[PDB]
Amino acid sequence: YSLQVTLTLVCLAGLLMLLTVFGNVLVIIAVFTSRALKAPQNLFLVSLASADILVATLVIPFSLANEVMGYWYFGKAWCEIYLALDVLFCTSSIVHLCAISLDRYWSITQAIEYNLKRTPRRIKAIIITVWVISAVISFPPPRCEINDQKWYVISSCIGSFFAPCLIMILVYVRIYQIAKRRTRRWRGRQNREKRFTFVLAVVIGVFVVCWFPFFFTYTLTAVGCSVPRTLFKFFFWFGYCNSSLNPVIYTIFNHDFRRAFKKILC
Numbered sequence: 001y002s003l004q005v006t007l008t009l010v011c012l013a014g015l016l017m018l019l020t021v022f023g024n025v026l027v028i029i030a031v032f033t034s035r036a037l038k039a040p041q042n043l044f045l046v047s048l049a050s051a052d053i054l055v056a057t058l059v060i061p062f063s064l065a066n067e068v069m070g071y072w073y074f075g076k077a078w079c080e081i082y083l084a085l086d087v088l089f090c091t092s093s094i095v096h097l098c099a100i101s102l103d104r105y106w107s108i109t110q111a112i113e114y115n116l117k118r119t120p121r122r123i124k125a126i127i128i129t130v131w132v133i134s135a136v137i138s139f140p141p142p143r144c145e146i147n148d149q150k151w152y153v154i155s156s157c158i159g160s161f162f163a164p165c166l167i168m169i170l171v172y173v174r175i176y177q178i179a180k181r182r183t184r185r186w187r188g189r190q191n192r193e194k195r196f197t198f199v200l201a202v203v204i205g206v207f208v209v210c211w212f213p214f215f216f217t218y219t220l221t222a223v224g225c226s227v228p229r230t231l232f233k234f235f236f237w238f239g240y241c242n243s244s245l246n247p248v249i250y251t252i253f254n255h256d257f258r259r260a261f262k263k264i265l266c
């Protein structure tokens with residue numbers, strides 16, 4: 001492997017881990033320290049931040065060690081569990097994003113009924129269901145490689161990314177259509193149209209641009225195309241990289257969160 005570039009790589013990934021943990025814990029605090037943030041829907045954000053902190057703190061070094069060291073030095077008793085835990089954490093983050101999107105959609109449409117049914121008990125039930133589905137989809141599993149079973153890989157990739165991606169796309173397309181239909185003083189309204197298009201396109205695009213390449217390229221390898229070469233590692237690294245940005249997308253566009261972060265910083 002590289003002799004000085006390894007220092008550049010290890011340096012860069014430590015930077016990544018730092019940024020991730022920082023932002024996610026900032027959220028967990030703001031959310032836990034802000035009275036205006038005492039809403040049942042922010043439990044999803046808290047769970048997502050906790051999952052991302054766990055992944056960044058523990059899974060990254062083993063993958064940072066791998067590639068860098070160049071081989072799996074830790075106990076072979078760990079690859080079969082390291083890979084599964086990585087899969088579980090990433091799928092849990094994705095499912096948390098999808099559940100947050102679904103809650104937003106159900107709050108925007110059928111607002112009265114869903115507000116009647118927005119109990120913290122239901123919020124916790126959804127959180128536990130997400131975690132249990134993440135555990136179920138990760139229950140099946142000098143070197144360590146990811147699983148290569150075609151059927152298992154295809155099923156896991158499909159049910160862990162493609163379904164939540166489609167659900168998020170549909171829900172946010174519906175939300176965009178609703179906002180546009182309700183869009184029609186006038187300068188403020190037209191400014192608001194532009195603002196919402198943005199906040200949604202960023203949310204719709206960061207997740208896709210960060211995960212679709214890996215999962216696409218992942219299946220491509222599984223289906224047999226396997227054209228991805230080295231770029232897969234870059235696509236792989238884009239995915240962890242996506243987690244660090246994840247809290248920013250979901251918290252910056254909310255004033256109650258902005259002001260809480262400003263208070264915390266100052």
Ligand SMILES: Cc1cccc2c(Nc3ccncc3)cccc12
Pocket residue numbers: 086087088090091146156157160214236237238239240
């Ligand atoms: C099916 C599945 C779902 C979630 C994560 C997985 C993973 N780990 C990654 C992959 C991309 N970025 C960060 C971590 C490896 C192999 C399969 C996975």
